[PDB]
Structure formats: structure tokens, C-alpha cells
Amino acid sequence: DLRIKSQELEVKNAAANDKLKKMVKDQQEAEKKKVMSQEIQEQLHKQQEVIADKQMSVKEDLDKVEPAVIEAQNAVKSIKKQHLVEVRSMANPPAAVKLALESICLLLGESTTDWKQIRSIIMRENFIPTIVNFSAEEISDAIREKMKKNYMSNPSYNYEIVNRASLACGPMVKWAIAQLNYADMLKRVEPLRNELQKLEDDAKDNQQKANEVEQMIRDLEASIARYKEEYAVLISEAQAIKADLAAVEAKVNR
């Protein structure tokens, strides 16, 4: 009798059907992960759209005031030393010159209102450098509105009137306007910069999560590929028993 073939195949198929159970387990674990991947990419796609517009919005907000600022800083620095002398030697200064330097002093924190102490500050051999090397991320909300309220709302406060009186207070007048408008814009850009960071951080972490899933998807495929090939050779060599059985039976009968 062929009592061995029975238990031989009973074990063969039992392990094979147990192999599919392990294979199908990962095959849909992979399908599950494949869904997450597309789901992540979708969430990541919509996210950069928000980043894109706001990132350009900041630039369009900055590009309107920025070139006026860097133009003024060059104008203030590149100045004739004799023009610094005439302001230094001003015993009785015009109302415009007084107005101009007051605004410069206000933006530099040291906001006084008397000429004799202003003239002291007007040139300490570091007056022009500290104006040039000056970021507008220092001016406060109060300082900004005070600058608007008193100075550049007053008809006498403009480049034409000031430069007419003094060639030195001319450039720094434009500088005072440019830095203030820059500070006005920073009120709008600051929340945009911040919310950009919140979004840019989440995007990078979302991309990491994406790469993590993709590798998990690919690692499952490798394990699946082994089980497929192993089961493939399992029943491949198994039907050879059907060939052999049919053959030897045919031999016995004939």
C-alpha cells in the first residue's frame, strides 16, 4: 500500500496552507501600508501649497520696502565728511534739521528733545555707523506710531525740505522713512514667518513618516517574495508525487 504518500502530502499541504496564512498576513499588511503612503502624499501635497503662497507673499511684502532701505543705508554711509562738519558746528539749527535728527534719535532709542544733547549725540564718531548697521527688528509698536504721529505726519518733515536746509540730514531722513515702513511691514510678516515655521516643521516630519512607510512597504515585499518562491517550489516538487503515482499505477496495471 501507499500509506506513506498520504501523510507525506498531509504535512506538505498543511505547511503550504500555513505558509499562505503568513504570506497573506503580510500581503495585506503591505496593502494597508500602501494606503497610508498615498494618504500621506496627499496631505503633504496640500500642505506645500499653503507654504508656497505664504512664502512668496512674504517676499512680495518685503520687496516693496527693502530696496528703499538698502539704498538709504548706502546714502547715509557714503556721505561727505564736510557735510558732517556743518551739522556738528550748527550753533543755531533750522527747524527741519532739528526735526530730522530727533527722528533718528528716536529710532535709535536715545530719544531726546534738546539740541545741545542732540548735538552731543549727533556725532560721536559712531553716529553714522550705528545708523547703517541697524536692523529694523528693534523698533517697537509704540516707537513706530509715535514716529508717525509727530514726525512724518508733519508737513515740514520730508526729504526736499530737510535736504534744502542740510545735505547731511538729507539721507538719514529717507532712512527714517524706509526703516519705519519696514517696521510697518514686519507687523504683517512676523505672523507669516511664524506660521510658516509651524508648517515647514510638520512637512519635514510628514516626509520622514512618508519615507518610513515606503521602506516598510518595501521590506514587506522582500519577505513576501521569499514566501512566494518557497511555496512555489513546495507544490512544484509535490505534484511530482502525482506524476510518480500515476506512472507506477499504470505500470502495475499494465
CA neighbours within 13 Å on the CB side: how many for 3?
1
d(CA 56, CA 210): 26
C-alpha cell at 34: 500602501
The CA–CA distances, whole Å, from 227 to 64, 68, 160, 194, 237 equal 64, 69, 85, 50, 16
- Give the chain as a DSSP string: --HHHHHHHHHHHHHHHHHHHHHHHHHHHHHHHHHHHHHHHHHHHHHHHHHHHHHHHHHHHHTTTHHHHHHHHHHHHS--HHHHHHHHT-SS--HHHHHHHHHHHHHTS-----HHHHHHHH-SS-HHHHHHS--SSS--HHHHHHHHHHTTTSTT-SHHHHHHH-SSHHHHHHHHHHHHHHHHHHHHHHHHHHHHHHHHHHHHHHHHHHHHHHHHHHHHHHHHHHHHHHHHHHHHTTTHHHHHHHHHHHHHH-
Judge contact between 173 and 100, C-beta under 8 A: yes
Chain centroid to Cα 41, Å, comes to 18
Classify the phi-psi angles of 157: left when phi > 0, otherwise alpha if psi is within -120 to 50, otherwise beta: beta
Q: Using alpha carbons only, what angle is made at residue 141 by residues 140 and 146, rounded to the nearest 5 degrees? A: 95
d(CA 185, CA 207): 32
For 231, other C-beta atoms within 10 Å of its C-beta total: 17
Q: Give phi and psi for 60, each to the nearest 5.
A: -65, -30
Q: At what angle do helices 115-122 and 95-107 cross, to 10 degrees?
A: 60
Overall residue count recorded for the chain in this entry: 254
**C-alpha torsion sign, points 207, 208, 213, 217:** positive
Q: Which residues contact 209 (CB under 8 A, 6 or more apart)?
A: 40
Q: What method did the depositors use to determine the structure?
A: X-ray
Q: Give phi and psi for 44, each to the nearest 5.
A: -80, -30
C-alpha cell at 33: 501600508
Overall resolution, Å: 3.0
CA-wise closest residue to 98 among 150, 142, 134: 150
CA-wise closest residue to 140 among 173, 111, 161, 100: 111
CA neighbours within 13 Å on the CB side: how many for 30?
16
**C-alpha torsion sign, points 76, 138, 183, 108:** negative
The CA–CA distances, whole Å, from 73 to 80, 87, 152, 177, 181 equal 14, 19, 19, 12, 14
C-alpha cell at 103: 527722528
119 burial via Cβ count (<10 Å: 0-12, 13-18, 19+): middle
Judge contact between 189 and 61, C-beta under 8 A: yes
C-alpha cell at 122: 549727533
Q: Give phi and psi for 222, each to the nearest 5.
A: -65, -45
**C-alpha torsion sign, points 47, 49, 54, 59:** positive
**C-alpha torsion sign, points 195, 201, 205, 206:** positive
CA-wise closest residue to 185 among 68, 32, 90: 68
